[PDB]
Amino acid sequence: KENALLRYLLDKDD
Amino acid sequence: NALLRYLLDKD
Amino acid sequence: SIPHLILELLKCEPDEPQVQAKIMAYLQQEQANRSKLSTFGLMCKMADQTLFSIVEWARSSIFFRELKVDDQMKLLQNCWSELLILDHIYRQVVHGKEGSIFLVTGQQVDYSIIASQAGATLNNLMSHAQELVAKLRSLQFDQREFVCLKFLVLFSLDVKNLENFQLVEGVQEQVNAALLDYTMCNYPQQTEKFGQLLLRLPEIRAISMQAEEYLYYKHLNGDVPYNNLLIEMLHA
Numbered sequence A: 001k002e003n004a005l006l007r008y009l010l011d012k013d014d
Numbered sequence B: 001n002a003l004l005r006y007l008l009d010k011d
Numbered sequence C: 001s002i003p004h005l006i007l008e009l010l011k012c013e014p015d016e017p018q019v020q021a022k023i024m025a026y027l028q029q030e031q032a033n034r035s036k037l038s039t040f041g042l043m044c045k046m047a048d049q050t051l052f053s054i055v056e057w058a059r060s061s062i063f064f065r066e067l068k069v070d071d072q073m074k075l076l077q078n079c080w081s082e083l084l085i086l087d088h089i090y091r092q093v094v095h096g097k098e099g100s101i102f103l104v105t106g107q108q109v110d111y112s113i114i115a116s117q118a119g120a121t122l123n124n125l126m127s128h129a130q131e132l133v134a135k136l137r138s139l140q141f142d143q144r145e146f147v148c149l150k151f152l153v154l155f156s157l158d159v160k161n162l163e164n165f166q167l168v169e170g171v172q173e174q175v176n177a178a179l180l181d182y183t184m185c186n187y188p189q190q191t192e193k194f195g196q197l198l199l200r201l202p203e204i205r206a207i208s209m210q211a212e213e214y215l216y217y218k219h220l221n222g223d224v225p226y227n228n229l230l231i232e233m234l235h236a
Ligand SMILES: CCCCCCCCC/C=C\CCCCC(=O)O[C@@H](COC(=O)CCCCCC/C=C/CCCCCCCCC)COP(=O)(O)OC[C@H](O)CO
Pocket: C039, C040, C041, C043, C044, C047, C081, C084, C085, C088, C101, C113, C114, C115, C117, C118, C119, C120, C121, C122, C123, C125, C126, C129, C208, C211, C212, C214, C215, C218, C230
């Protein structure tokens, strides 16, 4: 939701 | 759980 | 005579030979930046690659493919460790032997290479797994039965906050019923086959609980590599 990687980067911890 | 979401949404 | 459903699920099975070459390939490609990790640290690396592999298997699998990502996450967050355990167990039955563990990368490894440097926690765990692997050799556990167990594991009815719950039960009861037919048709003189298979599920659940606690311990003891997937899964 909003380009996987991008979201993973915003959300991911650390 | 960002990583798991990524793996299912990725490519 | 393999039921209708089992044949479908049976086609979602990844290319076993291909996965070994790839995970093996990654472990090597990774190796290239330290003039380093221990045996354990390497096994971790191999394990979370097995995880990436499993998630892809579920993601493009009959039925699972139709769940909202939120449901997909809830189911996998609930059975990831048990899917990995079932996976490793089925591998020992199909390829394993005597006093030798068959790794996901394709190589056999005498038990002594593992036993030599193993502590108390890991010992209980490796022993429980052994007992289970043997119980399954004893039942002549096959691939048809294997994929059924995987779906019964994936589509658990113990996971809450599930939106499309009605679909989970569908497959649960459906795969359950397929297995019920399969065993009575392919193994008539062994009416207990069905039951023994279903009773391994609780065992796979237990071993996997233990494996997570043991892995959390290793991570707290600073034994686990910087942020691998498994640890990111345990965080939840
Ligand atoms: C056998 C069933 C799995 C056992 C480990 C389960 C939880 C952990 C899963 C991922 C890590 C596996 C670690 C395997 C052992 C390992 O890498 O390192 C060991 C040494 O190396 C060897 O024994 C030699 C290598 C051993 C090869 C083992 C082959 C099987 C590994 C994969 C199993 C399938 C994936 C399971 C994933 C489950 C979720 C984590 C560590 O012994 P130690 O930790 O100090 O005991 C401490 C003690 O328990 C302090 O008291």
